[PDB]
Design a protein around this ligand. Structure first.
Ligand code: HEM
Ligand SMILES: Clc1ccccc1C(c1ccccc1)(c1ccccc1)n1ccnc1
Ligand SMILES: Clc1ccccc1C(c1ccccc1)(c1ccccc1)n1ccnc1
Length: 394
């Protein structure tokens, strides 16, 4: 009746979510937030944007959406802005990144010894380097860019109800946003082919982005790639380490890797929950929910729901997977804009791990392994051990 268990103890959280799907699939917590646990009900909510709005500022007095952020806005404005941003951040822009992601990955892994932190070595520097280059930032600016991004990632280790959270976020986000806004002005003066240049030049149905909107979107790209590569890649290695036969399977046929990625997403989604606000009195699975309250859709619970997935707690890459049905990227019109980049970056990273090492295991003699306590499902670091590498003279 009391409290939502924390992210850190994954077993207890998963156990609790099980009991809820079973006994209270639509639950109202002590703060008046409504949780939704079943795959079918989560889908219902995510599809009905008219009832379940993505704007959480509407019920907070003088707060308004962040300009250039598509995840806080509803149709029809949502469609119009995602059109503008996509015309810049295009499918071909992402896919063209493969050789460089591979190059950076291969270089970063070649200097890692045999015992190292997978996050410090790879999962943290790779996405920052890639986004920075995508954005067109001078190499000399990259370190500070990653410093700002890292500081924001570190904050997510902290309690979200800590009343200083908002202020701490502001002290890093402000200079980061200032920086990007100044780069947008620069590309406006002299546009090239980098993403910031495409952002300031983009226009769809007469809608163009100002430097504020362009910089905010660029900020979301940085933080999205950084946090998610850190979390998903760690989850990939942790999960494979629990089912180590797949390492050999993927070594013999690297074409098996995209399915592994999808199954790790299902099994250990970087974001276990998403939020909506009701716009009117409504119902989920016969349970009445009043107007103007927050609803939490538990992607984690839905992904483990036996009505949606056979033997839902079995790690099994052989499942049908892929595409728009990957609930870990959400569902419907807000389906992750970065899904192609996520899928690409983590596939290349896993290809390269296997290429050099054959496998990694989570280091047992090291608990630098601190789980994110809220928002994210995974760890800030992942101490690993390579049993084999090209460095062995045997
Ligand atoms: C494994 C990696 C990732 C996961 C698990 C993930 C997850 C998600 C989820 C669940 C949503 C939907 C939020 C909602 O419905 O309210 C979303 C939206 C979004 N994601 Fe990702 N994401 C990942 C990687 C990325 C990357 C690399 C980018 C870089 C652009 C990105 C950018 C975005 C953007 C801009 C939105 C808002 C889309 C919209 O509102 O139309 N994500 N993401
Ligand atoms: Cl964490 C989060 C969740 C949902 C929306 C925005 C953010 C965000 C943030 C803050 C700290 C660490 C990582 C991300 C954020 C998301 C994307 C880009 C920048 C910041 N944020 C919190 C307050 N304003 C913006
Ligand atoms: Cl970029 C970010 C940082 C920290 C937490 C969440 C996100 C973000 C998101 C927003 C709502 C629900 C789940 C995740 C996000 C926040 C603000 C703007 C864009 C994306 N995200 C990271 C990757 N894809 C989406």
């Amino acid at each position: 009746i009391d409290e939502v268990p924390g992210m850190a103890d994954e077993t207890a959280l998963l156990d609790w979510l099980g009991t809820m799907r079973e006994k209270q699939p639509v639950w109202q917590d002590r703060y008046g937030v409504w949780h939704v646990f079943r795959h079918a009900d989560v889908q219902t909510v995510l599809r009905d944007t008219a009832t379940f709005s993505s704007d959480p500022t509407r019920v907070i007095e003088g707060a308004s959406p962040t300009p250039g952020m598509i995840h806080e806005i509803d149709p029809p404005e949502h469609r119009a802005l995602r059109k503008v941003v996509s015309s810049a951040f295009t499918p071909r822009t992402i896919s063209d990144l493969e050789p460089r992601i591979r190059d950076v990955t291969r270089s970063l892994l070649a200097d890692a010894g045999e015992s190292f932190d997978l996050v410090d070595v790879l999962a943290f520097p790779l996405p920052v380097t890639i986004v920075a280059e995508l954005l067109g930032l001078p190499p000399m600016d990259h370190e500070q860019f990653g410093d700002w991004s890292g500081a924001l990632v570190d904050i997510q280790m902290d309690d979200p109800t800590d009343p200083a959270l908002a202020e701490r976020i502001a002290d890093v986000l402000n200079p980061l946003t200032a920086y990007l806004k100044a780069r947008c002005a620069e590309r406006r003066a002299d546009p090239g082919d980098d993403l910031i240049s495409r952002l300031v030049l983009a226009e769809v149905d007469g809608r163009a982005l100002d430097d504020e909107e362009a910089a905010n979107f660029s900020t979301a790209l940085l933080l999205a790639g950084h946090i998610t590569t850190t979390v998903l890649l760690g989850n990939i290695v942790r999960t494979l380490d629990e089912h180590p036969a797949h390492w050999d399977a993927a070594a013999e046929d690297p074409g098996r890797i995209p399915a592994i990625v999808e199954e790790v997403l299902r099994y250990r989604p970087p974001f276990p929950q998403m939020q909506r606000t009701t716009t009117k009195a409504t119902e989920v699975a016969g349970v009445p929910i009043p107007a103007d309250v927050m609803v939490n859709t538990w992607v984690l619970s839905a992904n483990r729901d036996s009505d949606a997935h056979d033997d839902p707690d079995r790690f099994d890459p052989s499942r049908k997977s892929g595409g728009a049905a990957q609930l870990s990227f959400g569902h419907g019109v807000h389906f992750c804009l970065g899904a192609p980049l996520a899928r690409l970056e983590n596939r290349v990273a896993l290809e390269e791990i296997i290429a050099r090492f054959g496998r990694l295991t989570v280091d047992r003699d090291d608990e630098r392994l601190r789980h994110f306590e809220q928002i994210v499902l995974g760890t800030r670091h992942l101490p690993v051990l390579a049993g084999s590498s090209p460095r062995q003279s045997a």
